[PDB]
Amino acid sequence: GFESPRPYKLTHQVVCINNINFQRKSVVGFVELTIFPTVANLNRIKLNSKQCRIYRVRINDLEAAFIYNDPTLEVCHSESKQRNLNYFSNAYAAAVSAVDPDAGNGELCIKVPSELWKHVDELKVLKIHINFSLDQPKGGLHFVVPSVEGSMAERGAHVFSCGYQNSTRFWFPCVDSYSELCTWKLEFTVDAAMVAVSNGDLVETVYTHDMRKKTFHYMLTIPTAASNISLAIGPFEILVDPYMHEVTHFCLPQLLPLLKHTTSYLHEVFEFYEEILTCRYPYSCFKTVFIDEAYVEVAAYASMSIFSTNLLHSAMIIDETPLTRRCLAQSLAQQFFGCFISRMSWSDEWVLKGISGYIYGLWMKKTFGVNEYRHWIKEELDKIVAYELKTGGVLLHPIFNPASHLHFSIKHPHTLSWEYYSMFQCKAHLVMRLIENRISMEFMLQVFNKLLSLASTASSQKFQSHMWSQMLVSTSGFLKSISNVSGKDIQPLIKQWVDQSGVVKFYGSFAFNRKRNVLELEIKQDYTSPGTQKYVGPLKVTVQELDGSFNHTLQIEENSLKHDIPCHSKSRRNKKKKIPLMNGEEVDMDLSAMDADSPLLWIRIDPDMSVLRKVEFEQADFMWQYQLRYERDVVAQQESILALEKFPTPASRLALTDILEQEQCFYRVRMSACFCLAKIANSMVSTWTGPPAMKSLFTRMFCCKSCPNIVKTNNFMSFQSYFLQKTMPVAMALLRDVHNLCPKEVLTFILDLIKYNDNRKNKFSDNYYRAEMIDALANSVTPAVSVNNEVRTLDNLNPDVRLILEEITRFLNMEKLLPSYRHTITVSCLRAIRVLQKNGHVPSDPALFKSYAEYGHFVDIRIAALEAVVDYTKVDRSYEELQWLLNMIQNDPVPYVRHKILNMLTKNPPFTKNMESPLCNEALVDQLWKLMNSGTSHDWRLRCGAVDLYFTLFGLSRPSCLP
C-alpha cells in the first residue's frame, strides 16, 4: 500500500558520464529520465539537483524552460545578524524540506512545454533529456591526483563517489528519494587502462574508435534508491574471488596481496548470511573497491562497496584484520537488506538499519564467539545510556520534528548530527536484539525471509510502485509480519523504547531477613531526568545460591517498592559439595568470606540483558569478588571488575589477580582486571609491602624464569598473548606510588622490555605492540612542577624523562628510515610528544604537529597531529591555532579529514559556553556562523560537525559574549 509522493513515477533512469577529466576535476554527462504520470495535468516536473548546471533540458525532444533555486546554499541571509543556533537550525530545516526528495517541492523545477500539456494529461511514457557540466562538483565524487607528473592511469590517480545518504544528486541530477524505485542503466566513457566501477553487473564494453578510451555499460536488475547508486573511476587491479565467481575485488596497483588477505574471509561472511536467510544474495555480481582517502572507512552500495586503503592488510599484519573483516560484514549486511529493500519513507530507516546491524551481530557472535558478542552488546548499551544522559534522547522512527530536546531537527539525516545518527542506528540494532530475546530467533529470521521475498518479486516485475511497493518496507508491515509469525505483536516493545526515546536507570538495595530466609529487593529509578524514562515492566534478576543458579523475574511496579524472593537451603555450606554454575560445568567455591546468615553467593540484575537497562545495584565486596572469580557471563564479570574499582580491599585486588592467573578466561575481561588492579593499588598505596602489581605477572608469563629483565621472544600465534602483553606495561605505568609517581624501577623494567624485544620469532608484526610500548612510556612520565614559573629547558629536563624522550626520538627516526604499515609508531610518537610538551619538560611546539597534519604526510599521522593541535589550542586558549584549524576545514583536500577536525574540536572545545575566554570576539562568532551557512552544505556531514562545535562554544542561546 504505497503511493508515490511525486505525481510522476520514474520507471527507468539512464546515467551517462563521458570525457571525465582528472586534470580539470570536471564531469560532463547527459542523463535521460523515463517517467509515467499517475495523474492528469502533471505539468511542471521537479527533480533533485545540487550545484548542477544544465546546457539545456528537452522533454520528448522539445526544449523546456527550467528554473533552479538552492535554499541550502544560503540557509541564512547575509543581512540577518542572528547568532542563535536555534534560528539557524529552523531555517536549515525549512531549506532541507524544500530540497527533500520525499517532499513534492524540488530545488530544480522544469516547466513542461505548452504543446506537451496535451500529451501530459493522457497517461503515456514521458522522456526527459538533460545535459550537465560541472567544472568542480562538490560532494558528488572525490578526485585524488598524485604530485608526480605522469599519465593519470600510470600515476595511479583514482576517482570514487564521496559523501553519505543522498549525495547522488550532486554528481548527476536525479530523483534522489528512497521511495522512488527504477531500473538503472549506466554508461561511462573511461580510459582503457582504467576500469570503471558501477552499481549492477557490466552488461558490455565497447572500445572507442581512438581506442585510447573505452565505454563501460552497467545494468542493475533490481530497482534501487538513487542514493545507493555510486560511480568510481580508477586503474583498479581486477581480482575474481576463487570461492565465488560473482564476487569481484578492485584495489589500487601493487596492493593486490593486501586485498587478497582482506577478502579471504569475505566468502565466510557471505556463507553465514546465506545460512541464516534462505534467500540467496540478490545481485548478480558483488564488487569491492578499496581507495585512498575514502570519505567513509566502510561504505555500502547496491552491488558495490567503498573502503579505505588503510583497511587492506597483509597476512603478517594483526589487529587490523578483524576490523577489516567486521567492516566487510556490516557493509554486506546493509547490501543484503538496506540496499536490497529501499525505505518506504524517511521515518523507516531504523528498522532496515537495525536488521542489517542485528544480522551482522549474529555473524560476529558465530565468528568471535558468544562472549565477544555479549561484551559488544554491553558496549552498545553503555553508549546509548551515556549519550541520552549527555544530551536529549535517541528517538528512532521520526514522526513529526517531534523530540525537540536535540537542537538539530530530526526531519532529515543531513540535519541530524552524525554522532546522533550513528547512535540511532545502534539503538535500532539493540531493539532487534530485544525482539530476539522476546521471540525465538528462528521466527525473526523467517520474518526477514518474507521481506527479502517481497523485494525479489518487485525486482522480477516492472510494476510502477505496484509490485515495487512490496519491496519498500514500513514499520507497520514489520510489526504485522512478526505478529503473524509468532502470534505476538512487538508494538508494545517498540512503544516502550523507540516511541518513548528514554533510557532506564535502576538503583538496587537488598535487605535479607534471616528468620523468613527470603531476599527483599528495593528498586528506585532516576526517571526525573528528561532523557531517562520510568519502567513499569518486570526485571529479571539472577541470584546465585549454594544449591545452584536460580532465575527470578519481578515486575518493577511503582506501587510495590519491595520484591521478595525465597532463598535456597545453605546445607551446601554445612557439608562441602559441588555448586552448579549458570554454565553446565560447576566448580567448588570457597564460602569463608560469604556470611553464614546469607545462603546466596552473589546477586546479578538482568545478566541476560533481555531488555536494555542501566544497573546500579549495591552489593557486599566479598560477593562481587566471588561473582568475578566464578562468573560464566563476561558482562557480569565486567560489572564486578568495575564494582571492585570502588572497593580497595586486598581480597578484591586478589580476585583481579586470580582472574589474570586463571586459564580459559576472556582476554578482554583480563585486560579490564589489569587496569582495575592498577587503580586498586593506587587507592591502597603504602598498604602494599609486595613487589609492584603485574611486574611479577609479566616476568612469570612474558619473561624468562631465570632472568626477570630478559623477555621471552614475542609469539602472536595464539592471538590472545598480544592483547595481554600490551595491557600489562600500560597498567604498570598507570600503577603509581604514595607520591603518585610511576616507580623508576617499573619505568626501567619497561625500558628493558623494549631493549630485549625481538622480531625474529613472531611470525606476525610487532609494530602494533611497539606503538603500545611508546604509549606506556608517555603514560609513565609525570609532569615536573616549575619553580617561579621556570621555563622548560634541556638542562632542566628530568633524567628519567630524558631516557623516555631518547627512546621516542630514536623510534621516530627509525620510523622515518622504515615506516610502519599503518604508521602506528608515528601516531604513538606524536601522542608521546604531546604529553612531553604538555608536561614541564619540553617546550610545546604547535608547528611540529601542524607539519604532520599536512596532506603530504600519511592520513593516520595527520589525524593524530590535528588532535594534538586541538589539545594545544584548548590548553593555550590560542586564537591563531583555532583559526588554523578552521582554515584547514575550509580548504582540506579530503572531506573525511575536515569533518574529523570539527568533531575533535567539539570533543575538546577551546572554551565552553559557560566559561568566558578571550576568544569571545564577534568576528569569531560570525566566522563560525558563516562556516555553517556555506562551504559545509555539499558534504552534508561538515555542517553537522560545525553545528555541534557552535553548540559547545556558544549554544542554542545567542553567545553570552556577543558585542
Binding site: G156, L252, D292, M316, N813, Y821, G856, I861
Partner: peptide, 25 residues
C-alpha cells in the same frame, strides 16, 4: 640540532603505496 634531532617529516607524492607495503617481505 645535536641532541634529540628528528628527521624532518617529508610529504609523499604516493603516501598509500609506501605506508601499506611492509618494509620487509
Amino acid at each position: 640540532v645535536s641532541t634529540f634531532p628528528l628527521i624532518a617529516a617529508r610529504p609523499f607524492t604516493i603516501p598509500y603505496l609506501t605506508a601499506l607495503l611492509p618494509s620487509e617481505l
